[PDB]
Design a protein around this motif. Structure first.
Motif, PDB file in Angstrom:
ATOM      1  N   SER A  31       0.866  -1.205   0.000  1.00 61.86           N
ATOM      2  CA  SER A  31       0.000   0.000   0.000  1.00 61.86           C
ATOM      3  C   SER A  31       0.888   1.236   0.000  1.00 61.86           C
ATOM      4  O   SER A  31       0.641   2.177  -0.718  1.00 61.86           O
ATOM      5  CB  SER A  31      -0.953  -0.012   1.168  1.00 61.86           C
ATOM      6  N   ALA A  32       1.971   1.200   0.747  1.00 57.85           N
ATOM      7  CA  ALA A  32       2.955   2.302   0.722  1.00 57.85           C
ATOM      8  C   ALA A  32       3.508   2.583  -0.639  1.00 57.85           C
ATOM      9  O   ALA A  32       3.786   3.718  -0.956  1.00 57.85           O
ATOM     10  CB  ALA A  32       4.165   2.032   1.742  1.00 57.85           C
ATOM     11  N   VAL A  34       1.919   2.070  -3.492  1.00 59.29           N
ATOM     12  CA  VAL A  34       0.877   2.737  -4.272  1.00 59.29           C
ATOM     13  C   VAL A  34       0.911   4.237  -3.941  1.00 59.29           C
ATOM     14  O   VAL A  34       0.845   5.054  -4.878  1.00 59.29           O
ATOM     15  CB  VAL A  34      -0.509   2.156  -4.052  1.00 59.29           C
ATOM     16  N   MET A  35       1.061   4.588  -2.642  1.00 60.93           N
ATOM     17  CA  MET A  35       1.074   5.996  -2.212  1.00 60.93           C
ATOM     18  C   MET A  35       2.327   6.797  -2.657  1.00 60.93           C
ATOM     19  O   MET A  35       2.328   8.011  -2.600  1.00 60.93           O
ATOM     20  CB  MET A  35       0.863   6.110  -0.684  1.00 60.93           C
ATOM     21  N   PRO A  38       0.903   8.111  -6.466  1.00 60.71           N
ATOM     22  CA  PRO A  38      -0.517   7.786  -6.642  1.00 60.71           C
ATOM     23  C   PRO A  38      -1.164   8.361  -7.922  1.00 60.71           C
ATOM     24  O   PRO A  38      -2.163   7.818  -8.371  1.00 60.71           O
ATOM     25  CB  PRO A  38      -1.183   8.370  -5.356  1.00 60.71           C
TER      26      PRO A  38
ATOM     27  N   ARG B 241      -8.858   1.166  -9.925  1.00 63.58           N
ATOM     28  CA  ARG B 241      -7.738   2.012  -9.478  1.00 63.58           C
ATOM     29  C   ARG B 241      -8.159   2.884  -8.265  1.00 63.58           C
ATOM     30  O   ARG B 241      -7.381   3.028  -7.318  1.00 63.58           O
ATOM     31  CB  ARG B 241      -7.206   2.910 -10.639  1.00 63.58           C
ATOM     32  N   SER B 248      -5.157   1.534  -0.200  1.00 69.56           N
ATOM     33  CA  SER B 248      -3.778   1.799   0.030  1.00 69.56           C
ATOM     34  C   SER B 248      -3.606   2.963   0.990  1.00 69.56           C
ATOM     35  O   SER B 248      -2.767   2.936   1.887  1.00 69.56           O
ATOM     36  CB  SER B 248      -3.066   2.048  -1.295  1.00 69.56           C
TER      37      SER B 248
END
Ligand SMILES: [Zn+2]
Ligand SMILES: [Zn+2]
Lengths: 267, 267
Positions: A31-32, A34-35, A38, B241, B248
């Protein structure tokens, strides 16, 4: 007889078969990532624009605008949002999360941000759109403020003689608005409802605004000023120590007491 | 015709006549003073007790207990809560606020804290009481997790074929529980509902526990482990997405983008 079925019980226990410190680390890790980027290939356009710093910690004093500045510069920001639909979609989704985890003071500021933005839209006859990142996250501010204010409003709204928080947000009637609390909750609930319905353009009446009108009854900063004021002054009309504690702890959030243990058998 | 009435419009504008930086400072000042000695003359008793440090920042690793420790020492803490009703009342109200402003990871931990505590109560045949500070703030954890998880659950629960978040928490039926998300929300909603009703003792069936049963289907840590897991693995079944961004950003909350301006005309 209402029961949790046999199979679901197995499903529930089977988390124990998978939960592990490194599976969790690899989750925070994905998830990190993706951030990290973004917007991906599609951020809002590079441009010389007073909005550039928020189009790329948000600091309120540095990002502050007068009502008059919002009316002069708001249409530029609006066109940026509408003219970059992929970017606006990413912004919307990230804004929605931010507003769902914001502290109380931030969440007040976001209520005003959302209403002042609509007032600016109305001022310019610009439509109120579900895809607009500020309008479309009305539900986030709404739910944030409901979480934090619910037990205090249970007492306060009775003291005002009004419907409870859930009936307010369920009926969504302008004629129920009798104070600042009912105003913030009814208007944000109407606005969130029209967003969830996905109307292409959201009728100004949603905001209590009639044809050719300008929302003179909403002053930018009223959600913040007015809700802080009621958290302050309700204790003058109310003999409950628990209510006073509730209001006080909302205004002054440093942790003091209330958490007892952490128990996690799985990892 | 539904409208905001003339008088309420005056009420709304009149915040401008009172809102001021020093009125706000004096508000933060009064609520802060309440938080200085919130138990007043009646804190939980001084005693040699492993619970002393939480009876006076809560650190999870330092405050950590095994399931077996909770079963051995939980009854002591329970008797402290029940045998000090003024103190428990103050604790409850402060716990309620803390849990309504907790971050996502904290809010997961509090879901497990609440369920493990009930499981311990059940283990010892102790009643589940509305005045118990942990049981009585079930609604706070509930609303916190709803705020933060709602837009993600809108997608995920559809993918599971289940009722939406609001129907789950409205029907409150054990027979609706089919996974970890429905489990956490249905059980906490049942439990919050029985608290709000103020039953002296809350039936173990509220937790899906039958007569002489022990809640073998709930493992302490399951809310945390299981919800983090679904935020991780749903993106494997889902081509959105925005959903992926949502999940995320819930897992990785540092601010990146989403806040545009601060506008406050009143002070
Ligand atoms: Zn009160
Ligand atoms: Zn999805």
């Amino acid at each position: 007889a209402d029961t949790i079925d046999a199979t679901t019980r197995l499903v529930l226990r089977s988390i124990s078969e998978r939960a592990a410190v490194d599976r969790i680390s690899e989750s925070f890790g994905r998830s990190a990532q993706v951030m990290h980027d973004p917007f991906g290939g599609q951020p809002f356009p590079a441009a010389n624009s007073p909005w550039a710093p928020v189009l790329a910690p948000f600091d309120a004093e540095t990002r502050r605008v007068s009502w008059e500045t919002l009316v002069a510069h708001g249409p530029s920001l609006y066109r940026t949002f509408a003219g970059n639909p992929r970017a606006a979609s990413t912004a919307k989704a990230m804004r929605d999360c931010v507003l769902r985890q914001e502290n109380f003071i931030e969440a007040l500021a976001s209520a005003d941000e959302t209403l002042a933005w609509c007032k600016m839209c109305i001022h310019h006859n610009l439509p109120l759109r579900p895809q607009d990142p500020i309008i479309g996250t009305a539900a986030a501010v709404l739910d944030n403020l409901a979480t934090r204010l619910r037990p205090f409003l249970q007492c306060y709204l009775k003291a005002r003689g009004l419907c409870g928080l859930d009936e307010l947000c369920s009926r969504r009637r302008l004629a129920d608005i009798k104070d600042i609390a009912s105003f913030v909750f009814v208007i944000l609930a109407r606005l969130a409802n029209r967003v969830e319905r996905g109307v292409a353009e959201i009728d100004y009446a949603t905001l209590g605004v009639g044809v050719g009108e300008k929302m003179h009854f909403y002053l930018p900063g009223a959600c913040m000023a007015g809700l802080i004021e009621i958290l302050d002054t309700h204790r003058q009309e109310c003999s409950s120590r628990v209510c006073e504690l509730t209001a006080s702890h909302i205004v002054a959030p440093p942790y003091v007491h209330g958490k007892y243990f952490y128990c996690n058998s799985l990892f």
